[PDB]
Amino acid sequence: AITTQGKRIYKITVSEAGAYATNKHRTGYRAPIRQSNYTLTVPYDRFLPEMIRLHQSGAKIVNVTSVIS
Amino acid sequence: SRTVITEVIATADSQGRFLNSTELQAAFGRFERAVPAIEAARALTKNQDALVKGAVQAVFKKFPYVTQPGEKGYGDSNQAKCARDIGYYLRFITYSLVASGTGPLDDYVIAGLREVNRAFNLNPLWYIEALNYIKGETGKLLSGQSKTEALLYIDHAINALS
Amino acid sequence: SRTVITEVIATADSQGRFLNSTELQAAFGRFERAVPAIEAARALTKNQDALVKGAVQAVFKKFPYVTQPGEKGYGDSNQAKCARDIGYYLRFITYSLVASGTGPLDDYVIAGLREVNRAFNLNPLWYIEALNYIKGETGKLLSGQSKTEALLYIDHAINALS
Amino acid sequence: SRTVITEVIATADSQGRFLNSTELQAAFGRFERAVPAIEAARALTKNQDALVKGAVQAVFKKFPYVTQPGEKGYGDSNQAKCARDIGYYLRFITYSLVASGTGPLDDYVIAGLREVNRAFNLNPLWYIEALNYIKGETGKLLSGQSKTEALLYIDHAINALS
Amino acid sequence: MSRTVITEVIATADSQGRFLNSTELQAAFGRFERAVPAIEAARALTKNQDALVKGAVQAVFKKFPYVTQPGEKGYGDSNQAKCARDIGYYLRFITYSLVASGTGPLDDYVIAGLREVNRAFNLNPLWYIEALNYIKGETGKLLSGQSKTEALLYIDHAINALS
Amino acid sequence: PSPLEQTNTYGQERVQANAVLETPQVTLRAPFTEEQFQGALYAIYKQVFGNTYVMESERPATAESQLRDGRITVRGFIRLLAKSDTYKARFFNPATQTRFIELNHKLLLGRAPYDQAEISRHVALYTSQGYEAEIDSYLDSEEYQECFGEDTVPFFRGFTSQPGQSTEAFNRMVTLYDGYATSDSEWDRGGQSARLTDSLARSTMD
Amino acid sequence: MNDVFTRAIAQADLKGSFLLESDLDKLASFAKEGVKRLDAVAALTNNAPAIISDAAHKLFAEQQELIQPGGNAYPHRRMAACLRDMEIILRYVSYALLAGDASVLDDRCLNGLRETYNALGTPTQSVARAVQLMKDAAMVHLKSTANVTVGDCSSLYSEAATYFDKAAASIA
Amino acid sequence: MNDVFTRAIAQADLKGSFLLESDLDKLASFAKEGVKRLDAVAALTNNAPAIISDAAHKLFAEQQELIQPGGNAYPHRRMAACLRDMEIILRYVSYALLAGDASVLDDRCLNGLRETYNALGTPTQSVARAVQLMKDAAMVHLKSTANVTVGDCSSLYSEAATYFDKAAASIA
Amino acid sequence: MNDVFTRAIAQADLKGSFLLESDLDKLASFAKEGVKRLDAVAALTNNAPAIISDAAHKLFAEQQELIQPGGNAYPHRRMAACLRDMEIILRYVSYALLAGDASVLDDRCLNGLRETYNALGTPTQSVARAVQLMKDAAMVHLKSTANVTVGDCSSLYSEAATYFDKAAASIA
Ligand SMILES: CCC1=C(C)/C(=C/C2=NC(=C\c3[nH]c(/C=C4/NC(=O)[C@H](C)[C@H]4CC)c(C)c3CCC(=O)O)/C(CCC(=O)O)=C2C)NC1=O
Ligand SMILES: CCC1=C(C)/C(=C/C2=NC(=C\c3[nH]c(/C=C4/NC(=O)[C@H](C)[C@H]4CC)c(C)c3CCC(=O)O)/C(CCC(=O)O)=C2C)NC1=O
Ligand SMILES: CCC1=C(C)/C(=C/C2=NC(=C\c3[nH]c(/C=C4\NC(=O)[C@H](C)[C@H]4CC)c(C)c3CCC(=O)O)/C(CCC(=O)O)=C2C)NC1=O
Ligand SMILES: CCC1=C(C)/C(=C/C2=NC(=C\c3[nH]c(/C=C4\NC(=O)[C@H](C)[C@H]4CC)c(C)c3CCC(=O)O)/C(CCC(=O)O)=C2C)NC1=O
Ligand SMILES: CCC1=C(C)/C(=C/C2=NC(=C\c3[nH]c(/C=C4\NC(=O)[C@H](C)[C@H]4CC)c(C)c3CCC(=O)O)/C(CCC(=O)O)=C2C)NC1=O
Ligand SMILES: CCC1=C(C)/C(=C/C2=NC(=C\c3[nH]c(/C=C4\NC(=O)[C@H](C)[C@H]4CC)c(C)c3CCC(=O)O)/C(CCC(=O)O)=C2C)NC1=O
């Protein structure tokens, strides 16, 4: 985090894809329904768990942008 | 800002379920309280200027050592700001009465209150005394119910300011 | 249990605040509508036997096929337990009227009714036409606001069964 | 409390790792800066009574009206409480200088002071004036490193007050 | 708290708040049918343990000649006894994982926390890697049919863990 | 009726947690004002800090301001809360690591630990990758993610059966919660001693 | 956590009979008295800073050790906790008042406060005296009839007194 | 948890020896009967709702005080929790049957039920009667030969009976 | 959590009076020798892998009951936990040495470790023996004066040995 390699936070735009919604229905609505598209800001170190978890959830990454560098 | 039906909307959307009775009786509560607040708003619209001026004179009264030269009460533009402040507070009070809720009052004055108060040496007790005096004259200005909910709403404004 | 009074007190406790206007206006609403609600509950408690037994008869008339030997509705104990269940429902509708909230229904009969119903292959419809019988009578036994609100609560009962 | 060595121990615990040259350098510099801070503690300790009396009378000079009857300052018990509070503050400032940090001061005055302020109407500006007088008074009681570090401690306390 | 196919199935079913569907039954059937070659391999390895351990000792000696001279970690009669004991326990746990139809025994017994053991005892994995290399070389004839590959899978997983 | 009377919620009040089961979860979804904001923060602070009262000076203004704008989810704000030094000072600093993990489970997951194997694994995780990784693991855990969601304030999900929860979780959290009045500061010696270790021990063997 | 009607329903279902006409009459009377009870609750809510402040003043006048060095409330953090505990108990008492019965306190507020205060080292009798003076100040404010429909709320005053009394008893 | 093969590996590790030939023999005996185990668990799972429903029928028939008001099944939410309890106990006994080692039932299920139902006020004797009724209802489908190859499985009957007896004596 | 300076300030607050000039001089003397203490703890941390290696080797040479199956540290995971246990013990002893007070070691390793090991079944006397061996290796490594100015550090040696003594007495 504090490290120069820990910095360079990147923003992520996330779309709750159709496959994501189909998986969500079978798993169950334990979270409130929000509009499929939403934005998010993620540091470098926890950048990985974000798209990993989106991959098990079935969603796909719209794009990636860098806050720093 | 919320009217009672506004938090009704918020909840009903939040659980993703239709309105049950309870919020509907709340809607009543609002409607049957609406009219007394309506003539309250009328009366306070009538009395505004005297309210402001008398409040200025009384806040000078109970705190005379701020009217002395060299502090906040001293200053022509200072007193003009006192007057405009009182006007704004009681106008938002009328707004809240019309809404039958504290919503506009909250999101228009209450947010960031304390830090503004000590960030400019504007004593909260000044506005506490001003609002208390306003209770003093509005006790006779309004009668019956309208007096009661006016008392309660400026009381809530004081409690947030206190 | 679960009441508008209890909703107020919990939604003030979990945030640790003292009560302000909106919820106490809702309390006015509750305390004013208590009297029509409580007299409606009184009347319902006054006429229970006809309601329950005629509801059982109405279920038979709307489902003759459950009466014959060899199916689940057949049996003296089965009719006794009919009357028991419908009496419970009338019970809890009266309770909800008394509480001026749909709480006790939700706490007792609405919590988990689906899986217990499919546990014994119970058809919720049977109870729905029992409620239809009940609304048919309360269209006569009550008058206006008490009638309106009893109809409201029983309608919510079907809706939950729906 | 939060001393430099204490926070180093805590952070070394955090990452589950031993100490390194950087934090030992921090402890080193703490050890050397202790000696001027130790002399500051001596100078403040030997002057504590004059410090307290001068601060109390400086606050009185700035706001003599507080001493008027019907106000917080009026009353021999009230003045004794003023002096006792200022003495507690000075003792905690000595503990801050000894501990080479704000740890004890933060924990033992700054934690939960504004609550009492609001409850008991104890204006921070009074203690701010007292600490400003202590600043001016230690400007001559201390010089060099000790004066600068005691000044930064007490103005940290002042900024926390405001 | 071992992880075997049936135990993993049970844990998954308990986690999901449900009973066992078709896939769990099919997996149980597969494990039950594969147990017979695994038991065959376990018995065959049990028969010839001494040859395996001795050949592993001499293979470790021949691969790295720089060891068994005095003045280093591996030289010593107690060191030799520890070599024999370690290789014996390795083959013990390999047989256990063969019988369990899962790597859980090996994982929990040795692979759990092995690396800090090595770095606290200067034990580079390469010696035991060569030991298991000789072990698979010997078992290349010891077993037959399914049992051969059943042993191969678990021993290869153990080697990869050692890597 | 029966000679022995069993009220509707009788189990809720005979067990120490009745209002806990009655108290609903709180979410922060759409733009809002200071009032229910302050309420939500008060609820969060009572939740995370085991009914330890946090001095008003200690709280972070920047984090709550960013949450107010909404750029950071409530999950991120909870991360920032846990990472704050006051969390360690109340919890991590005066208490042993087993007791620390028990407290961390009870607070940020609202449930008792399932088996001693979980405690052992999480102690190993802490030893191998520091303090902050344990909190990142809890708040990144799939169990929390599904049971609460991105916008849910943690609540005591014990006192209630959960999907795939150990039978001892109920007993441990009954022994561990012990009421609204229970505090877990550097005081009372109850937040320091690991009560749950004895119960976790019996689950290791059979 | 139950109010008057909810608990009435509670033992009603416990006995397995319908709500008798007498109990309905009691509840209807309560609701008729409802606006007075709400008036008392509003009076409690309004004067909360005043009552907390002045009650603290009498407490710390009649005891000094709590503010003395090393006293059970000596640090500012501990003083603030000392005051907010009384604020919380007052808020819960007002909760019970509007709820008509003392269920809320026994349910959550005071079920296990005694062990907490032993563990914290707080003396119980001091807390009891603080609650008692809180009660006295609340009574004083409620007796005031300014800007309210005059009448007889003697039941309400006595009932809030019973609240505070059993709260102090639960402290012990 | 700790299955039968896990149990064998556990004892082998504890005494530090290899598998004996008799150990491989008994584990092969377990391996060959796995088909019968699959049949048994399929029978239990498929008939589970019917079994639990009729078992609850005999339950509430035999003890009529539980259902009626003041009983622990009355408020009809407790009924839902009761059905959940029957299904979960049958679920863990099916788990234990599949694993062949009663460790999973003892640890994951029966460790805390005793204190749990003390804290819940449930008559535990009733729950023991319940699980006994479960085994009575389930042995029907157990000896059912519909749609499957016929064969004596007396060991499976006895093992299921012992599992249910363990559960009963546990909650007893 | 608390060090010598914090502990002294705590006593000063307990009596409510300023720090005594004598105790201020004591703290000044402690700070003057702080460079020697920092050197001691640095010698601890560089030799910490060496200290733990030596202690583990000698303990395993003298005790063999753990390396065999059924030993408390027999599996790789168990003995790895053992190794990190001694590692953390030494780490907390070093932390106490930095602080000069045993409060932090009490807060971390000595509040409830005993019953923790009892539940785990860990024999405490083995832990105490490991503490003694680490203490011997540490006094050996710090009594050397490599690349650092020589001086009288017998006070630091005594303090570290006594910290190990309190740790050992706590565990066993
Ligand atoms: C769970 C079952 C188990 C395993 C897997 C095991 C391996 C093992 N071998 C050890 C020591 C040892 N092991 C060896 C064997 C070495 N000699 C060399 O030829 C080779 C590199 C290698 C074998 C081919 C030696 C020499 C030592 C002594 C290390 C020392 O004390 O310096 C140790 C450290 C314990 C001690 O020092 O007494 C372990 C844990 N022990 C077990 O109880
Ligand atoms: C912050 C204070 C503190 C520390 C550092 C601590 C260490 C610690 N040791 C543990 C178990 C253990 N501790 C040991 C150590 C034993 N091995 C040998 O045989 C000796 C008899 C002895 C060491 C000389 C072992 C082997 C285990 C694993 C228990 C098992 O799996 O059977 C555990 C719980 C399970 C785990 O983490 O895997 C902890 C937390 N506990 C604390 O409360
Ligand atoms: C809190 C209020 C409450 C509810 C909601 C409730 C649902 C309920 N109704 C029951 C009796 C029952 N009730 C019915 C259905 C009635 N009888 C049939 O003749 C008609 C078709 C129908 C009337 C329209 C049946 C079929 C059972 C028992 C199931 C059985 O024995 O087969 C049972 C016990 C099941 C049994 O004894 O086997 C429950 C849990 N119980 C309650 O105490
Ligand atoms: C950590 C140690 C500690 C301190 C320092 C502390 C301050 C403190 N001073 C108090 C009283 C007081 N404090 C003051 C001092 C202020 N009022 C003004 O008049 C002065 C201009 C100004 C002084 C600069 C006075 C006059 C009183 C008595 C009247 C009152 O309660 O406001 C009180 C209220 C309780 C009481 O004594 O009756 C507190 C909490 N409390 C603590 O636990
Ligand atoms: C953490 C404890 C610490 C502090 C607080 C610190 C400040 C500090 N700056 C110093 C010299 C100085 N400080 C300044 C900066 C100041 N002078 C200029 O007029 C500006 C108005 C102003 C900058 C805003 C300068 C220019 C010097 C002399 C240059 C030199 O360092 O040789 C001195 C030596 C004189 C003395 O004994 O007071 C101190 C202590 N050093 C420390 O180790
Ligand atoms: C890990 C698997 C698991 C088990 C073993 C389990 C037992 C269990 N049953 C419970 C409640 C209950 N359980 C029952 C059922 C019993 N009472 C009646 O007398 C019946 C005869 C009898 C059914 C066998 C009832 C009625 C309750 C509600 C008690 C209350 O709310 O006061 C509870 C409290 C929380 C809840 O589940 O709602 C547990 C933990 N729960 C689990 O998640």
Ligand SMILES: CCC1=C(C)/C(=C/C2=NC(=C\c3[nH]c(/C=C4\NC(=O)[C@H](C)[C@H]4CC)c(C)c3CCC(=O)O)/C(CCC(=O)O)=C2C)NC1=O
């Ligand atoms: C559910 C409602 C509720 C209760 C029941 C409650 C009791 C309570 N009192 C606490 C501390 C305290 N409570 C008091 C108050 C008492 N001690 C003094 O001696 C006085 C005699 C007396 C007040 C008049 C004090 C002084 C502390 C400070 C102890 C400490 O936290 O270190 C704490 C720890 C909270 C924290 O700081 O994180 C709790 C939970 N708090 C609540 O939110």
Ligand SMILES: CCC1=C(C)/C(=C/C2=NC(=C\c3[nH]c(/C=C4\NC(=O)[C@H](C)[C@H]4CC)c(C)c3CCC(=O)O)/C(CCC(=O)O)=C2C)NC1=O
């Ligand atoms: C939105 C908030 C709101 C409030 C709070 C409010 C007060 C209020 N007080 C009322 C009557 C009353 N109020 C009171 C209570 C007061 N009298 C004395 O006893 C006490 C000093 C004091 C109790 C704290 C009494 C006794 C009555 C007359 C009812 C009766 O005699 O039965 C009524 C009913 C109409 C009336 O008779 O005036 C209202 C609406 N109105 C509002 O719109």
Ligand SMILES: CCC1=C(C)/C(=C/C2=NC(=C\c3[nH]c(/C=C4\NC(=O)[C@H](C)[C@H]4CC)c(C)c3CCC(=O)O)/C(CCC(=O)O)=C2C)NC1=O
């Ligand atoms: C997909 C999961 C799966 C299932 C469901 C399964 C059942 C199954 N059981 C079989 C043989 C058998 N199944 C059973 C068990 C049954 N016979 C007994 O009489 C009882 C009624 C009952 C056990 C309580 C028996 C005894 C055999 C004959 C095997 C032998 O010689 O012992 C067979 C081989 C015959 C065929 O394919 O038609 C299957 C497929 N196998 C599977 O892989």
Ligand SMILES: CCC1=C(C)/C(=C/C2=NC(=C\c3[nH]c(/C=C4\NC(=O)[C@H](C)[C@H]4CC)c(C)c3CCC(=O)O)/C(CCC(=O)O)=C2C)NC1=O
């Ligand atoms: C990054 C942390 C750090 C280190 C490591 C460090 C080493 C260090 N040790 C010093 C003195 C010293 N260091 C020691 C300690 C050593 N001598 C004894 O023989 C022991 C074997 C051993 C400690 C166990 C002693 C006794 C002195 C002499 C005291 C003095 O010079 O005032 C000095 C002062 C050199 C001088 O005054 O000319 C330094 C810089 N300084 C630091 O800021």
